[model samples]
Target: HMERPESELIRQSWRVVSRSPLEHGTVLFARLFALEPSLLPLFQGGGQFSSSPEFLDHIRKVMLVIDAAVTNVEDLSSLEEYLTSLGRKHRAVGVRLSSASTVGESLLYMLEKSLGPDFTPATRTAWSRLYGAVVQAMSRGW
Candidate 1:
């Protein structure tokens, strides 16, 4: 479970993120690709990536997961179970442990850039803890 302060921080920050989830997702995947170009091919089998309907569909799915996680920041058990299932699915699609780490780093970067002045140290720490929890849950599947 997250500390009360951390949970509050995450919940507040999520309000900002939920405003434009697709935009955030776009920045996230773009950053992910830039940070790890080799990962791009893993997404290509689905569609044209950036502009294709398939790409947006994938982004929406990802955003929904993030939304659920953030919404449940104070409920670690639920988050863990959700992420573990997600991780197993990702594993079936060839996601490596290292890839999960990259996704966490890239997501934090995206939040930092997107949140602007609201991305305080406490918010960053909260997000780090949240992402760390996600990675830990995902690792269980590996």
Candidate 2:
């Protein structure tokens, strides 16, 4: 089993996002588009290529939620629900289970590249497990 201090996990996760919010956001959307670019029709205006400001804001919110879920998961049930809802939304928009897996992998890769030696085995283990739990949840009822 992989384990890391909660403090280190939080700090590392923040570092990952802080260094590449847009790239991270693109990865999120990449999953969405990979499964189904047709979901573009759902957006009223620019769709997937929508203005950077609008898209970036959404991405930032995602980062914020990730931070919160990592640091303040007092109510696992509620947190699961929220995460599931987001997963469902992505699914509805054509996101696939495969893409979720890819996103999780890419996140780790990005962290490893950016954090270098700062990203210890413990950090990788913790993040992999964390994302595994999320992917498991997202895969439910698929």
Candidate 3:
């Protein structure tokens, strides 16, 4: 379990985005691309990235994954096994593991855009802790 107060901050901060997953996902993807458009080049599996709708589909998936983490702030191990294999799956698919940090930073940026001034430092730290836990678990595949 996590510190009650921190988890509370994470959950509460997530509420607005939870209600509109796509909108928040849009923010996240926009930030990610802006930071590193080259990140998308690895996934030439299809012309999927050519369209916004296709891109949004993946963004929503990323949002849902974070939602999973936000919901399980306490006892994150419940998701550990799954994410490890998920990371493995992505690695097998030729995805760069370093994207985790970039994605984490994008998530924080998304929260900042959504929360405005309400995105306090404490909230950022709480989210960072949770994201780090998830990324650390995912790293087991290496």
Candidate 4:
């Protein structure tokens, strides 16, 4: 999923999202899901919990938790609890580690396919590093 063009676009998108996960929580993820509807099923209760608003809210909560965790960098032991909850919520239906990774991949893919020529390599690498941190942080309990 990290083809040259897509990778470049994702890098740019990552920088934008990394600057404010809250903003990306709403707008960017909405767009990502629009591009990849298959991911909707990964949430709880199958299709019932997959509405745009519900998905957006769930993402917003996740981003807020991430923001707080990064800023304080304290008592991270509770992070495992958060991850466990998230895993339970996701795994309840069917979301797996691989599926989560696929969601990340799809974000870059959507960015490249949607943003087109504006995406750059340096920006792509920057975003990739930022996103990698997020993905890694969230994977603690997995």
Candidate 5:
């Protein structure tokens, strides 16, 4: 449950990501790979390091889901259902808890890099809390 200020911060920063979801996805994946090369195997056949159509599609889908969660933060039950399904899919593909946590970290890093000044401390805390909630919800499948 995010506070009003946290929700506002997330919504505002999310707008920057909305401007170019694809571009943001590209950067997100690149950072993910750089931070953890082993995760690349999960994206195998998705294409050459975030450039392939499959990779783009993957990122697009993930980002859209994230956007939905952010947009509907007030209705967390729905988001939990969505994330549960997402976690099941990822589990099927062998996604571990550690991997999910790393993804959250990578996402925050990407947002910081992309949003620049807009990624303030308050925004960072909001994102971190949101990510924690997301991971907690997703953990139900594990």
Candidate 6:
């Protein structure tokens, strides 16, 4: 169901970001807050939580799910049940589906910033499709 070229591109780009998971994940969450300040209430901070250790734990948690996606990019159906549960959990906390997509946007931002010129258009599209697949599974729980 997925293209070979895109899968390969995703893995390569992800390797760069996943190397220092916390360091780059920090970038992703930081961008998310900046792009969607309204989401801050979810964290109960209203903004500005750059070095909060507990917040970093949440970042790590999100990174793990993304890591799972990259590992199963070639066959996302494998995580369908788990992602659905994850989606259901988020929904319980008042998170809208659109917010999940924003997380993807920030992921791309982090990848691009981390990879520089290496973040090719093809790679970008690859991550988009991959993230969509993950979210698609998650939406099923809703």
* Global fold similarity of model 5 (TM-score): 0.88
lDDT of 6 by residue, 18-82 (tens): 88999998898899989887766566354565332256778889889989988888898779989
Candidate 1 per-residue C-alpha lDDT over 24-130 given as tens digits, one digit per residue, 9 for 90 to 100: 88899888888777766556364355332356678899888878878778876767777788788777777778887788888888889878888899998889888
TM-score of 6: 0.88
lDDT (10s digit) by residue, model 4, range 29-114: 56656756676665565375433235656777766665544443323454656655666665555555665655666555544554
Please give the CA lDDT of all the candidate structures: 0.80, 0.63, 0.82, 0.54, 0.81, 0.84
Best by lDDT: 6
Q: Give all TM-scores, in the order shown.
A: 0.86, 0.65, 0.86, 0.48, 0.88, 0.88
Pairs with backbone N, CA or C atoms under 3 Å apart (clashes), candidate 6: none
- Winner of 2 and 3 under TM-score: 3
How well does candidate 6 match the true structure, expressed as C-alpha RMSD?
3.2
| Residue 47 C-alpha lDDT in model 5 | 38
Task: Residues 4-88, candidate 5: write the lDDT tens digits.
Answer: 8889999988998889999988888888888777766666384355422367778889898888879876556778887888888
Regions of candidate 6 where Cα sits further than 4 Å from its true position? 44-53
Q: Give per-residue CA lDDT, model 3, range 14-130, as digits (tens).
A: 997788889888788778878877756544343455422256677677778888998789888889898998889777766677988888889998899889998999999989999
Error of 4 at 55 (Å): 2.5
Residue-wise C-alpha lDDT for candidate 2, range 1-142, written one tens digit per residue: 2234644675666666677777866766666656556544444564645312356566688677766656643223446666777778777766567666666766676666666787788778767766776666556634
